[PDB]
Design a protein around this ligand. Structure first.
Ligand SMILES: Cc1[nH]c(CC2=c3cc(S(=O)(=O)N(C)c4cccc(Cl)c4)ccc3=NC2=O)c(C)c1C
Length: 264
């Protein structure tokens, strides 16, 4: 009852599109609070409503909240003024510093520390999937009922599942199974995105050949303005043994220390 929003309360403006996914579409909406409304133009209804209960109960400053569900069902989400983290760091109008970028990474880690503590596996962590609000607070997003595929370029087929190979751990590429430890691998790649200001990872690699490229003894290179301790953290995130990768709690700890050494 706490998850359901009355159809009287929501106005969804289909003329103004925020983004087009594969399975649905997200629009500007009004609830007076400005929101984003995900349409699903099917799946089990039982599993849908129970997923919305888990999601609604997630409350963390660095995790995207679910405002609610309007009864195809409509998923109501907060409005995020500055859009996704990747586009934000690529914008020629914005000037984040090295400290700012490490800080964005710290916020994500805190968001993921929160999600990991609820035994929730994100599966698609990447800068494109983190959103910023008006206070430039980074929110880990595109999970649960909100989950879709918006930048088709970064997902590759084959089970004919369409997967973000360039963000995936070795074992996930082999087994197609995702864990919090494979989320940790994705977080290392996200750290790399931040320090290169939204560069595509492994440009001259194609698709599932990534496994062969990694097994060559390769990792993403250190960005110029990435601090040495931050690069060492990335390498730990990409440990070949999943269980030897740092927890998000350890990552929050290590990154908060690096962050604190910078001014401005
Ligand atoms: C001004 C603005 N807002 C947004 C996106 C946006 C959300 C994305 C999400 S999401 O990461 O969970 N998600 C489903 C999503 C992920 C990528 C692209 C898009 Cl359009 C949506 C959730 C709430 C949002 N509120 C928003 O305003 C974008 C991409 C822009 C340019």
């Amino acid at each position: 009852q706490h998850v359901v929003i009355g159809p009287s309360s929501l106005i969804v403006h289909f003329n103004e599109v925020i983004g087009r996914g594969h399975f649905g579409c997200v629009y500007h909406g009004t609830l007076k609070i400005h929101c984003a409304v995900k349409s699903l133009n099917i799946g089990e209804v039982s599993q849908f409503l129970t997923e919305g209960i888990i999601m609604k109960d997630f409350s963390h400053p660095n995790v995207l909240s679910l405002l609610g569900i309007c009864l195809s069902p409509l998923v109501v989400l907060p409005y995020m003024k500055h859009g996704d983290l990747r586009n934000f760091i690529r914008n020629e109008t914005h000037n984040p510093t090295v400290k700012d970028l490490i800080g964005f990474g710290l916020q994500v880690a805190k968001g993921m520390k929160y999600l990991a503590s609820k035994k929730f596996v994100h599966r698609d962590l990447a800068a494109r999937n983190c959103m910023l609000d008006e206070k430039f607070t980074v929110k880990v997003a595109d999970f649960g009922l909100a989950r879709d595929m918006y930048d088709k370029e970064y997902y590759s087929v084959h089970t004919g599942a369409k997967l973000p190979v360039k963000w995936m751990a070795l074992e996930s590429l082999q087994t197609q199974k995702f864990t919090t430890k494979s989320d940790v691998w994705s977080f290392g790649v996200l750290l790399w995105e931040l320090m290169t200001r939204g560069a595509p990872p492994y440009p001259d690699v194609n698709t599932f050949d990534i496994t062969v490229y990694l097994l060559q003894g390769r990792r993403l290179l250190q960005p110029e303005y990435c601090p040495d301790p931050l690069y060492e953290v990335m390498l730990k995130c990409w440990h070949p043994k999943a269980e030897m990768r740092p927890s998000f709690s350890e990552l929050v700890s290590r990154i908060s220390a690096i962050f604190s050494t910078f001014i401005g």
